[PDB]
């Protein structure tokens, strides 16, 4: 799963990442920059202000290096590039600090290995910072933002 998360570059430094899921390249819209892969950087991307997710269609060749997706979100324990995340009560929680502002694209996987979320931000609170994330319900993509979450 290293060759499925592509970083976005701004003046020489990774300012977030653009994930490759489900026959769609997608990225946190609010983070600025350019896709590191030049082949994927020259694609047109449709933004959406009210959803903060800028996506496009992956080129036909590289569909293989794209992760599998799910919409069914049982209560329980999910993966992350920074340790683990917990899904409970319609929220996602991480250990505080695990999330640094600037890694604001990376995905959240499930136990079976298929993307269930795309982090955008954190709402810092107590021992467990909530993750403001854009999920995909069965046919809609929906933003879950706890109050005061700060764009990573």
């Amino acid at each position: 799963e290293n060759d499925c998360i592509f970083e976005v570059k701004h003046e020489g430094k990774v300012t977030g990442y653009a994930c490759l899921v489900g026959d769609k390249v997608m990225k946190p819209a609010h983070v600025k920059g350019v896709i590191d892969n030049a082949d994927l950087a020259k694609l047109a991307f449709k933004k959406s202000s009210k959803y903060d997710l800028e996506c496009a269609q992956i080129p036909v060749h590289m569909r293989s290096d794209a992760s599998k997706y799910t919409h069914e979100k049982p209560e329980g324990h999910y993966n992350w590039h920074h340790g683990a995340v917990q899904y409970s009560g319609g929220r996602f929680t991480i250990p505080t600090g695990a999330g640094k502002p600037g890694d604001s694209g990376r995905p959240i996987f499930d136990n079976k290995g298929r993307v269930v979320a795309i982090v955008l931000g954190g709402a810092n609170e107590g021992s467990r910072t909530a993750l403001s994330v854009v999920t995909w319900n069965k046919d809609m993509v929906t933003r879950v933002t706890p109050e005061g979450s700060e764009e990573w």
Binding site: G89, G90, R91, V144, T145, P146, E147
Partner: protein
């Protein structure tokens, strides 16, 4: 003056009844842990903008 006063009392009473109805239908959904507020009532009555 009397007609206008009666019109004002009618308007205010009706509007108060309307806002009371708003309450009586939406407060059962603000005291639940899960702010569903189905978009039917969400549009029909101005929805509190529940904050997930």
């Amino acid at each position: 003056v009397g007609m206008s006063l009666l019109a004002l009392i009618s308007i205010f009473a009706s509007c108060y009844m309307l806002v009371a109805a708003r309450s009586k239908c939406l407060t059962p959904y603000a005291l639940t842990p899960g702010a569903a507020v189905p978009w039917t009532l969400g549009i029909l009555c101005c929805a509190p903008r529940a904050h997930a």
